[PDB]
Amino acid sequence: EWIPETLYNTAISAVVDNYIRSRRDIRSLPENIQFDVYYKLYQQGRLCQLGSEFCELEVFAKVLRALDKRHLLHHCFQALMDHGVKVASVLAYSFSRRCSYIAESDAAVKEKAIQVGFVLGGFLSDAGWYSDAEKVFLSCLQLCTLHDEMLHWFRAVECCVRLLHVRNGNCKYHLGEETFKLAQTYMDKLSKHGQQANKAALYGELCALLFAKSHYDEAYKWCIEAMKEITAGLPVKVVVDVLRQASKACVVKREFKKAEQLIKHAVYLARDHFGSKHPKYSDTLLDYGFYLLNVDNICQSVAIYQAALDIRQSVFGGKNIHVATAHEDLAYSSYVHQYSSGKFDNALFHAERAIGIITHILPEDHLLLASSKRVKALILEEIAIDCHNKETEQRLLQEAHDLHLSSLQLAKKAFGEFNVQTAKHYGNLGRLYQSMRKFKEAEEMHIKAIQIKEQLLGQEDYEVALSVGHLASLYNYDMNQYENAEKLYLRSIAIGKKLFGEGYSGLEYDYRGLIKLYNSIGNYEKVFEYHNVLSNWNRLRDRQYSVTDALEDVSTSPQSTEEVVQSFLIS
């Protein structure tokens, strides 16, 4: 149609083409214009002319007030970080140095810089630079501690709710508890002095910290406490933040009726306000796909991580931890979904991507690098079985052995010996030893895996049953201890149908194993007794398979706020 360009979009391209002469005068332009000049520099690809200005804190304070075009700033910021220049670490250090100089000032200048820190530290934390956002908040925190009145106590607890969030994406859990304890010190002081603070966002972080350390018993306790303080006056960003973390603790609690209403309300609440492109919406989808994968709704769990990844791949550039986290979970979901098929080439690409990103931006001994490392190892051991080349079978299976042990060490260093995540690596390493023909070694890993999970989770739980089936296949298919395997298969059968029914698609490896269990010990009557149940499993799975996609399952306005909270709280 050949429509001419607006005079604005023409004057933008004429001051950018004359940027060297006009760099001094551009910084004096209004915020809406100034960001559009800088975004034009990114569009032209002149990142050096741009990162020379974002490294200054004052300019990055001006381009942080453009809230409409923040989604363009994240892609412009992430492009700088991959370009070279450490624009995140320079901004965080340049703020801490400037923040440390106004300690001997009044409460007007200090509140000006604290608000800069809350939008800068609120941006680096949003872009994934948790190790660099914490340095901003730790400087904002020490501004609130200087003045000990009722006014600044509400900001010190506003830093500690954010410090507790940048210390979980950075997997610094052992500092998280000390942060929460310091928050209560600034909460009890404020609450006692005739001013009650909303303790809803802060307890939501503990619903993810204690979830991360596999304290699901403690996670659900703070899940209830978080939602008891949900008020309609809270920001939607805070409210959707509590819901997604509350869902993750409820799903791992293996109760799914209360879990769906929390996260489907969260996805709706993060889609009507934030829209289908804001990273927070994709953040909710990532936790929504956690619900789908644990309820055996694996078919549409891949489609919700792919949606979650595609949002983050557009807002958060190439090499970002948030993109890498989506690559990790999508690789795991594609691993689970296509486990039966045995084809892992898209899943391997996603798992390899999540390591090519995290190893670039995180140290070699980071906990989040360990969880993303186990997913490649799970994929590698299946390729090391499906491939028919013995040389490839041995070497690829050995590579997956170094990844689990490296992943186990990082989990064992921070989560301790007695945790589900540490035991989750024992079970994965147990399955690997089964494929490595080390059936003697595979016995003691699963025994240590079940004993840790049984002691912590309980005698009957979904995670315990899924670990037993790993041991049951060991005692049945390649160790010939059918008497020992007889109770193990039955143990997982009861738990498997306890929370999913007979149509649980994971029972295929449980029912078929029972058929091979009875094939070598006689009693062929029970072979047909389990043979029709496998057909019953076939009938009860494909009939319920036909269901609409979860993206439209939430639809438009399914329920209302302050109603899902009350419905969940009373139950």
Binding site: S28, L29, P30, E31, R65
Partner: protein, 107 residues
């Protein structure tokens, strides 16, 4: 004087704009010179240095309109038995006094 951002005292601009916004809403007479002058004062507040006074401008206007309609509300509730004539007399002034004020606040 150029249209680049500059430091401006809110009270002087808001007082110089409160008289125009009071006459725009009530469909009074504001000259062409002042109405076109008042667009620059709106702009100079949304790009004012160091802090953009766009939030203060929108809050003070919100307080001003909330003051105005409840002022018209007191001039209608007291006029019983003729509310319908008084409401529409005060509505066609305000319905045009909102779109006109929407144009002034376009930036």
């Amino acid at each position: 004087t150029s249209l680049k951002p500059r430091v401006v005292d809110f009270d002087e601009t808001w007082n110089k704009l409160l008289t125009t916004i009071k006459a725009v809403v009530m469909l009074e007479y504001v000259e062409r010179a002042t109405w076109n002058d008042r667009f620059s004062d709106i702009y100079a507040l949304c790009v004012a240095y160091p802090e953009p006074l766009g939030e203060r401008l929108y809050t003070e206007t919100k307080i001003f309109l909330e003051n105005h309609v409840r002022h018209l509300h007191k001039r209608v509730l007291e006029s019983e038995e003729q509310v319908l004539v008084m409401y529409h007399r005060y509505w066609e002034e305000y319905s045009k006094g909102a779109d006109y004020m929407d144009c002034l606040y376009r930036y």
